[PDB]
Amino acid sequence: PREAAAHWVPFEDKANMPDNVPDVVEVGATSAPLLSASYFIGAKCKPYNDDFMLCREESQGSGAIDCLKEGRRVTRCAVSVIEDINKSCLDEFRLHWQCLEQNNHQLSGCRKAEALLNKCVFTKLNLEKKIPGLRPDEEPVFLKKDPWIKPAVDDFKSVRAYAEAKKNGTL
């Protein structure tokens, strides 16, 4: 919760998870894939993560030491989601963060690559991006048409993929 030093030195410890906690399948996803699939792991693993922050709340002082069962719980289901999308829409999902690896991860960059993915995951993995807190008669901003902030350079692959989504009638 604090920025680093004048001259901080990094350090690590070659030790292990000692006795009781079994090993987990720890998320080996870099920022751009998990940022892309953030809505879907928030959609499927909603009450699990909600339980996580609830249990971290009620464990005042215990905190970190209490909910190890739950840190085991909430990561694994997200790993299940990303493995299912590794099997599901790996071309288009990868393409979404092939676009999103530029633009400083600004989500404003890759609308045309995004809407191709929204049909795909809702087809096979049958999940959906939903923005909570958005009261009705208010357009969700990745659903709207003619945005004000149009991005800098759309990638060359997903624009052709978008045209082919129109020609195949998948859109």
Binding site: M53, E58, S59, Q60, G61, G63
Partner: protein, 59 residues
């Protein structure tokens, strides 16, 4: 008659003494939080700075 008058006066003064000594105890009495600080906001619990807050801070 004069002793009745002085009964009234001396009882008035003892009323005065047992007024003031009690009022001195009323000074040094432990005051509640409702009188001492703001009447509403009856807790002193700060719970401030809630933007980057972390679940589990209460104890």
């Amino acid at each position: 008659d004069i002793l009745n008058e002085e009964a009234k006066i001396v009882q008035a003064l003892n009323n005065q003494r047992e007024l003031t000594i009690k009022m001195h105890e009323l000074k040094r009495e432990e005051k509640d939080y409702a009188h001492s600080y703001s009447p509403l906001f009856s807790d002193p619990v700060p719970q401030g700075g809630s933007i980057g807050k972390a679940p589990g801070s209460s104890r």
